[PDB]
């Protein structure tokens, strides 16, 4: 048998917004859970009252999605993913 070809297009997989936002939302969700648990351990360890507004933050998901879809990086791993739409003509 010949050496396995890597240029075969069938062995290649493309990634649209689905997989990218799956990785991104996955990591951001993990960080969210870790931070919430950190607030839980701080609450039970320092012996105080609990609050739902200080445990679950929204700027981690908002800053993660807004920052990743705002800049070219998808977090340098990946760059040049997001580009400004070219409105020179319709075929462009």
């Amino acid at each position: 048998k010949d050496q396995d070809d890597r240029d075969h297009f069938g062995k290649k997989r493309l990634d649209l917004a689905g997989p990218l936002l799956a990785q991104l939302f996955k990591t951001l969700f993990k960080k969210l859970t870790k931070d919430i648990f950190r607030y839980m351990q701080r609450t039970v360890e320092e012996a105080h009252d609990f609050n739902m507004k200080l445990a679950i933050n929204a700027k981690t998901i908002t800053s993660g999605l807004k920052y990743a879809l705002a800049t070219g990086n998808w977090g340098s791993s990946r760059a040049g993913v997001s580009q400004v739409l070219n409105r020179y003509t319709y075929s462009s």
Binding site: I61, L65, K66
Partner: protein
């Protein structure tokens, strides 16, 4: 659905035209049913 929360505190529906004119971000809010339990074990 897509929405916008302004500076004074009012949140209304967003359209892509007004999103482009006001330099906003066309996004939608996300909620989660968070369940809590306490075991004593």
């Amino acid at each position: 659905k897509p929405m916008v929360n302004e500076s004074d505190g009012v949140t209304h529906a967003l359209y892509p035209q007004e999103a482009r004119l006001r330099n906003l971000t066309y996004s939608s809010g996300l909620f989660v049913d968070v369940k809590k339990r306490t075991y004593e074990l």
